[PDB]
Amino acid sequence: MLVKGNEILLKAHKEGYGVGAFNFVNFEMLNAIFEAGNEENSPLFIQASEGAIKYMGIDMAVGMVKIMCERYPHIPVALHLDHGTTFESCEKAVKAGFTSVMIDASHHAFEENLELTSKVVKMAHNAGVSVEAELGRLVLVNPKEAEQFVKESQVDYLAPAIGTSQGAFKFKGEPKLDFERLQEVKRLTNIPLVLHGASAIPDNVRKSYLDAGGDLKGSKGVPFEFLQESVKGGINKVNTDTDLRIAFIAEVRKVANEDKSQFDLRKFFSPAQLALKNVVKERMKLLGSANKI
Amino acid sequence: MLVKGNEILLKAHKEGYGVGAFNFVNFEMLNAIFEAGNEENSPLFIQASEGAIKYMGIDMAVGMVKIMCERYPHIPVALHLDHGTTFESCEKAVKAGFTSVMIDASHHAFEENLELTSKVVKMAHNAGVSVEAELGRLVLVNPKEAEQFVKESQVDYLAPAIGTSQGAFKFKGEPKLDFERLQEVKRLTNIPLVLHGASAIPDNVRKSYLDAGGDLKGSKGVPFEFLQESVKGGINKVNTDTDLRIAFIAEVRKVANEDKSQFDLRKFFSPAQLALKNVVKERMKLLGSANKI
Numbered sequence: 001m002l003v004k005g006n007e008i009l010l011k012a013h014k015e016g017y018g019v020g021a022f023n024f025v026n027f028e029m030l031n032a033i034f035e036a037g038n039e040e041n042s043p044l045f046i047q048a049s050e051g052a053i054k055y056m057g058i059d060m061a062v063g064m065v066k067i068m069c070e071r072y073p074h075i076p077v078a079l080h081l082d083h084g085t086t087f088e089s090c091e092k093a094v095k096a097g098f099t100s101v102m103i104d105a106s107h108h109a110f111e112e113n114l115e116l117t118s119k120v121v122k123m124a125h126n127a128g129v130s131v132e133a134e135l136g137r138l139v140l141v142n143p144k145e146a147e148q149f150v151k152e153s154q155v156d157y158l159a160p161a162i163g164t165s166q167g168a169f170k171f172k173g174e175p176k177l178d179f180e181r182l183q184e185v186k187r188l189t190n191i192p193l194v195l196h197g198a199s200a201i202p203d204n205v206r207k208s209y210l211d212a213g214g215d216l217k218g219s220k221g222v223p224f225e226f227l228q229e230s231v232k233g234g235i236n237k238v239n240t241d242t243d244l245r246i247a248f249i250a251e252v253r254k255v256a257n258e259d260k261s262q263f264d265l266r267k268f269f270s271p272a273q274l275a276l277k278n279v280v281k282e283r284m285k286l287l288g289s290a291n292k293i
Numbered sequence: 294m295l296v297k298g299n300e301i302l303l304k305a306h307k308e309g310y311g312v313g314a315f316n317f318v319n320f321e322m323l324n325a326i327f328e329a330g331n332e333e334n335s336p337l338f339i340q341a342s343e344g345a346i347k348y349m350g351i352d353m354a355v356g357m358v359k360i361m362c363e364r365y366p367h368i369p370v371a372l373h374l375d376h377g378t379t380f381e382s383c384e385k386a387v388k389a390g391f392t393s394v395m396i397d398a399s400h401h402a403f404e405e406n407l408e409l410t411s412k413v414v415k416m417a418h419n420a421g422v423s424v425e426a427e428l429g430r431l432v433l434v435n436p437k438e439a440e441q442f443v444k445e446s447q448v449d450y451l452a453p454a455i456g457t458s459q460g461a462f463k464f465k466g467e468p469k470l471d472f473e474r475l476q477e478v479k480r481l482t483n484i485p486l487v488l489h490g491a492s493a494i495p496d497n498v499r500k501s502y503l504d505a506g507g508d509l510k511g512s513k514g515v516p517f518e519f520l521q522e523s524v525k526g527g528i529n530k531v532n533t534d535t536d537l538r539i540a541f542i543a544e545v546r547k548v549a550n551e552d553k554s555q556f557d558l559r560k561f562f563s564p565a566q567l568a569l570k571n572v573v574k575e576r577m578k579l580l581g582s583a584n585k586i
């Protein structure tokens with residue numbers, strides 16, 4: 001059912017596994033994510049960016065998720081505002097029925113990040129909603145700042161900057177994350193931690209995109225082994241979007257290429273869903289949330 | 294608001310205009326149809342085939358439409374089961390919250406078509422739901438059968454076969470509809486009538502699809518003049534699906550062609566929605582439902 005984000009991530013935190021947090025922008029993405037969680041017996045963090053909310057309308061974002069939760073009532077599901085940029089955005093999401101919100105104030109200095117995060121926390125906690133915040137920028141996180149930040153804000157989960165970035169082009173050179181920094185943040189905060197920009201661009205997904213004529217020149221994701229190490233170091237929420245988009249659109253491109261007369265939307269989007277679903281299933285197994293319901 | 298199908302079509306019947314009945318299979322199609330109705334101040338007949346229902350799940354089909362109706366509460370909206378094939382399918386749609394159902398038993402002899410239609414009508418009317426049925430096969434409708442069929446079944450609207458067929462390949466030669474037969478059916482039945490297979494494949498939609506590298510293989514739709522003539526003859530519900538699909542997928546193909554690196558779903562489907570929306574807006578104006586709310 002639909003639950004406070006902390007309910008899912010406190011369990012992941014105590015038991016030492018990661019829960020993928022999967023972005024969606026429409027029905028097909030959402031359906032594939034839920035079918036993956038059903039088939040792997042995994043809790044689900046469903047998240048929507050501000051741009052996805054603008055695209056769907058917040059009433060449809062929440063409404064579709066509530067329908068899906070009722071279709072799969074045995075699955076723990078949190079609905080999360082990804083990278084909220086203002087207090088007002090977070091409050092709108094709380095009012096609309098989100099059960100988790102992120103405020104990203106990491107571009108501010110410590111004191112202003114802490115003040116704004118604390119304001120969001122007060123509002124969200126009064127409504128029974130969990131909160132995520134972010135600290136560090138690609139300076140990386142200062143673990144002693146993280147300790148104080150968490151204690152004074154009462155934020156439920158923290159995204160510490162340790163070297164990732166969003167999108168398909170994460171590293172110009174070799175992938176590198178600061179796992180010593182991660183472990184220190186974890187030791188000092190003892191709360192669930194969040195990894196942003198955690199897509200891997202799996203080889204089979206890349207191959208499908210390229211086979212269909214797509215271009216991923218220069219792309220580099222987070223290696224599977226880095227994701228596993230991140231979870232071993234205390235990451236409990238793993239933000240995943242790019243992988244889902246590439247797998248989905250690879251299949252759309254393939255259908256377009258192989259039949260110029262095909263215009264039934266279902267013929268494009270059923271194989272697209274299947275590819276997205278399979279990415280999510282494999283990721284749930286990798287992060288350790290499979291068979292946790 | 295969400296209303297019985299007869300609420301919309303009795304008005305169109307008495308005032309002599311046509312209401313497009315627009316198919317959807319997902320959020321993007323539905324959103325574009327609604328935005329068109331809002332922009333043209335037109336009532337909305339939203340319909341879902343059995344295949345679309347299998348694809349979305351009937352809970353999501355109804356749920357998304359209810360969200361959209363609450364977003365645009367001033368628009369009359371009916372939610373219609375298109376080409377229901379069994380009593381049980383029609384009953385499932387009634388129970389899930391459809392406000393109109395079609396039973397297609399036109400492949401049966403008159404007596405069996407009447408028997409099955411009457412059984413659906415009894416069930417649907419007991420639930421406050423309107424019913425569509427079909428008579429004739431591409432042998433065309435017998436107007437005296439239509440008269441008796443409507444009188445005995447109490448069906449709310451009738452699809453009389455006058456020469457259309459579904460899909461892009463309607464006429465292996467010159468377009469032709471039996472308007473004399475249409476007028477006789479209308480005179481004898483005095484109820485709202487339905488035109489199936491009513492896509493036009495407009496020149497600009499064909500051009501967009503071909504520019505995007507698609508192939509329509511000699512497809513020909515119902516000319517705009519024939520649609521207008523059919524409304525003048527008493528057609529009040531105009532089933533439209535192919536035109537929407539072609540316009541939508543043309544834009545998906547175009548994005549895929551022009552940027553091989555693009556995999557943001559919204560970048561494919563925002564222009565696709567726009568193209569679908571414009572087809573619907575133009576069709577509402579053509580059929581006479583614009584500025585009728």
Ligand SMILES: O=C(COP(=O)(O)O)[C@@H](O)[C@@H](O)[C@H](O)COP(=O)(O)O
Nearest residue numbers: 049166167197198199239240241242
């Ligand atoms: O960290 C993430 C994904 O990491 P990755 O790119 O590695 O999948 C997410 O929190 C966000 O980046 C999200 O994807 C942004 O979505 P839009 O603003 O709608 O384009």
Ligand SMILES: O=C(COP(=O)(O)O)[C@@H](O)[C@@H](O)[C@H](O)COP(=O)(O)O
Nearest residue numbers: 342459460490491492532533534535
């Ligand atoms: O008459 C119609 C549209 O005519 P046109 O093809 O001219 O748009 C519709 O009632 C049906 O044909 C409907 O489109 C079938 O949908 P699926 O079974 O989901 O493929």
Ligand code: NA
Nearest residue numbers: 082083102132
């Ligand atoms: Na987030």
Ligand code: NA
Nearest residue numbers: 375376395425
């Ligand atoms: Na119909």
Ligand SMILES: [Zn+2]
Nearest residue numbers: 166196197239
């Ligand atoms: Zn992020």
Ligand SMILES: [Zn+2]
Nearest residue numbers: 104134159196
């Ligand atoms: Zn971030």
Ligand SMILES: [Zn+2]
Nearest residue numbers: 459489490532
């Ligand atoms: Zn039809």
Ligand SMILES: [Zn+2]
Nearest residue numbers: 397427452489
């Ligand atoms: Zn038919």
